[PDB]
Symmetry: C5
């Protein structure tokens, strides 16, 4: 129920990796098998929830893929992250490019606004993830003005019920105030959402929102491993 | 009327690794041409040009502009270029400029030169764009008037073809721009003249720029490189 | 005791390191032995006090661990820092990511505001460290007004007495004005403090506050070295 | 009026290079000879004119030397630049640090303002080169107001007839709007000119003007190559 | 007023280097003797005056030591800087991190304000060096208002006569407008001067003032060399 989801403690991490040319090679059948064994086991221990593994090929220089994983305790993401890097070839041959950490919290004025992953909704086939930093004046602004700006913001999104939002505090978990993730069945709906949301007063209260990471949720880690540069 | 076309457009900018190509490039070239010839036959990814960027900027050397109906088709081609060709193996990705063609806000005959199927220019400049935060909540007929005046400022440059394409959430930018022309100086002069527009008061970012010359085949580009 | 505490000379440095991929390897026993013998040697010399060694796993690309050490004279930190880099393999196989240097001073208006490390408090199990730079107008502002803004800033932290603050001048010891460290028993307390502190007039007088370094205090250097990426 | 000189087509490129420590060694006589041959070859083909080679030792980190060369067609500079890198050991043992490209055009108002290199003046013994970006409002501003401002700007340079300006459009040849190069017999004259030009209304209409490259024109390649780190 | 010291021509460079890990090793006595011979050779040549060599250990990532040297002609510094890098093993195993160049000039209003090094003062045991860039409106402000702001700025330092100032033009000698160095018997007085100088109206007319380089003047090259990482 809706207090329970608001009260829930869940850290969420987007871990973006870059491939190291030369490191992976071209014989990957066992690398694939080992990495799926690693995640299947994660799934079985029941502490870290891998919401998706995303192929970011062609999104940006210096990034190749992303793991989205979630846990009640940050220490459990730290452990999974450390093990991935140490106990799988995939993690050994990849560089950490960027880490987006966040912690679920009740929204300020609308307690029915909850991240897709907290709602337990099926993850979308396509995602864009990016951090966010608000104006300096945003939180100390008169609350009723912020409230109406956020209301208008939400109404501007109503044309996109198929795009699921995740707006999550990120204070002191890195350099940002929020971790944003939008999930959708087609990437053009994510592009068009971002374009439409420019038409809102809330854009007057924005300081940072890059880097973006956009890509395709793989059905299984084979699809990712097999595309990476060797 | 309504040109249907959904198209994604990517500018993939690569940096040559000094000392990686060396002097025996003929197998590298032949392998690279076979990759590109193979893309043409599959018929999903159209390569509008390969560009020599030599001398434009440090840390960039060449650029691939290819276009497809689904972004996953460009991901596969881009991944395949880097994975299965030595040319892709001995280069570094410097920058990726991604976009998705959409209709213009006000004037529905404003269409990118590649969507129109027009001949690619001998010379190209490519760069990203981010408007000021106040731009899209501006009164709509004001923004319409500004964009129309901005368009008029280019009438002396019919030989420069424009490509202004949404890039929201495909990277760090809002628009992907490419101007194609038969001579580089027409591009320099167009950008200079377009500064004399009210639209310039509503800009936040427009770098990095990539400017260079369209080559006829891979051989022409690869023989230029420092390797 | 507040006058002696306010008049004391103490430099504080946060030395943030990253591990060089491929440098540590599997045989790490001499490295740990040599490492703790370095830190034991520091404690017996009695000059440089290690408040904590912290594992920053999961926090950000390009940083893996942090040392927090304190000394009456900066040249003693210089000597300890250089010795770590020069005479330990752990320091030899690590890259310096960032240094946050500071010198304790009395606060401007409230002289009972003192860093936890100066108060001799037990360090917290979790930490976040970040530099701070005020707006150009902050110091030349009317003192009554800056004083009232700072008192409201302090009151906004009223529900986080378990989060211990260290706000320490950093002028001319790097690119910053202040070095901040917040110490707590659980990470979520740190995140929520930062979130609530956004609702303050002080936020209209801020220029820079990144990068952030967040992680967990380890009980000894053994626990750190065996967690690091290989 | 200067109608022919205003109408000529000339691209101008500043190619800045960084020496790779350890790459040259100390047996440089043949590296020099090969480099001299390459510049000999460019004179002979008559398409690319080298106005100067500059020793930038001590100006800034990560640059060591610069070539200023000029051609009617950009592709002639492209070919010669690429050939320097690909077909001489000096270019092979150097990294490109930064490129500043430009294309001469008539001035907006004072058509007697023409680059030193376009006028055919002897190149100065000392040079400073930097790119330039005007404020967003500069070109859409009322022409009468921009004309007044540029008139005051030219007048502020009245005491420096010995410092020769090259103010050359750079739109779409890079990240900048103008390429600036100031040539003089003495470096102090350039420092003093730059200082004096801060006293102009035009400074209220500036957005970017770094990096700077300042250095000493050499007589021949041997003078530069013998300076470089081995 | 101080006409001859105000009239004289001196270029001043701060040359900051970072050690290259792995390069120096543990065999250093002959590296030191050679470097001392190179510095002896400079003093006997009588053109380049080394005011100090500074241990920067622990100040910031990617910097380790600094040379401060001074000469009537900038090509003399260029030659010494290049000879250091090319012909001493210490120069060869070091990377240039940052260069801060400047040219002495008379102050705008107070001709009794002169750099410590121009006045022939013994160098301080501790230094902080940093570049500076004023606001775009600073130089075109009414001169009587800028004069008053600078006089109040000077008065704010009245309590720190022990911290000696060098405020030197840097236009066209890099990316900045001024090169600042503050030298003192004690580091803590430098920190406190910087803090106190925030309480000035001049602070409303600042654009840039980083990177900072802070450290201790060594008596002998051996003192520096023996602390660097191997
Ligand atoms: C996209 C996008 C961005 C980033 C780009 C931009 O700046 O526009 C974006 C930015 C943010 C940011 C920060 C916050 C954090 C709160 C703050 O104080 O900023 C943030 C927070 C909220 N958003 Fe937001 N958003 N957002 C959607 C998409 C985007 N949103 C869609 C879609 C919906 C609608 C679907 C849903 O509610 O789940 C939606 C609604 C809300 C609500 C609920 C509003 C209401 O009361 O109606 C809250 C709270
Ligand atoms: C160059 C250049 C830039 C970037 C530099 C600058 O800011 O000046 C530049 C920037 C943009 C940007 C963003 C947009 C996207 C819409 C927005 O809301 O920004 C953007 C959009 C439009 N542009 Fe634009 N431009 N632009 C041309 C060149 C440049 N344009 C030339 C040439 C023509 C002439 C027509 C053609 O040949 O296609 C032209 C016309 C249009 C029209 C059609 C307007 C009309 O006539 O009603 C639309 C829509
Ligand atoms: C968190 C955080 C930041 C950075 C983020 C932000 O800007 O909100 C933050 C920023 C700063 C900065 C700079 C300064 C330095 C003085 C200045 O002129 O900025 C700075 C200085 C002070 N803080 Fe501060 N803080 N701060 C706390 C947490 C944060 N603080 C908590 C908790 C408490 C309460 C507990 C305690 O005093 O120990 C607290 C109180 C004070 C007091 C005492 C106030 C009083 O008289 O009531 C002074 C002085
Ligand atoms: C130095 C310096 C800078 C960069 C730093 C700053 O912004 O102060 C500097 C910046 C620029 C820039 C961009 C432009 C390009 C036009 C624009 O629209 O900005 C630019 C353009 C002009 N400048 Fe300029 N300058 N500048 C000189 C030095 C500097 N100038 C000296 C010397 C002379 C005088 C000698 C000569 O005519 O050749 C001089 C004169 C002119 C004239 C002719 C004006 C006149 O005399 O009526 C034009 C046009
Ligand atoms: C520290 C510090 C900074 C940088 C931080 C800040 O912005 O406060 C700092 C910044 C600058 C900068 C640029 C300039 C260059 C001129 C300009 O137009 O900015 C610059 C120039 C001057 N400073 Fe300055 N300073 N400064 C001192 C310390 C600092 N100063 C101390 C100490 C004294 C006093 C001792 C002395 O005269 O040498 C002192 C005084 C002067 C005078 C003499 C003023 C007078 O009484 O008429 C001039 C001229």
């Amino acid at each position: 129920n809706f207090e329970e989801l608001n009260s829930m403690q869940r850290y969420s991490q987007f871990a973006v990796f870059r491939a190291i040319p030369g490191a992976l090679g071209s014989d990957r059948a066992e690398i694939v098998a080992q990495a799926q064994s690693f995640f299947d086991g994660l799934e079985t221990a029941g502490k870290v929830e891998v919401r998706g593994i995303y192929d970011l090929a062609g999104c940006r220089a210096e990034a190749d893929f992303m793991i989205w994983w979630i846990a009640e305790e940050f220490e459990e993401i730290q452990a999974a992250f450390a093990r991935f890097r140490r106990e799988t070839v995939l993690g050994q041959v990849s560089e950490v490019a960027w880490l987006g950490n966040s912690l679920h919290r009740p929204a300020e004025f609308n307690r029915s606004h909850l991240p897709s992953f907290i709602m337990g909704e099926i993850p979308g086939d396509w995602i864009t993830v990016y951090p966010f930093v608000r104006s300096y004046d945003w939180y100390i602004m008169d609350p009723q003005k912020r409230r109406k700006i956020l209301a208008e913001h939400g109404q501007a999104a109503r044309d996109f019920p198929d795009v699921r939002a995740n707006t999550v505090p990120a204070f002191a978990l890195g350099d940002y105030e929020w971790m944003l993730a939008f999930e959708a069945p087609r990437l053009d709906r994510i592009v068009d959402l971002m374009h439409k949301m420019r038409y809102t007063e809330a854009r007057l209260h924005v300081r940072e929102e890059t880097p973006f990471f956009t890509g395709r949720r793989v059905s299984e880690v084979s699809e990712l491993v097999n595309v990476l540069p060797g």
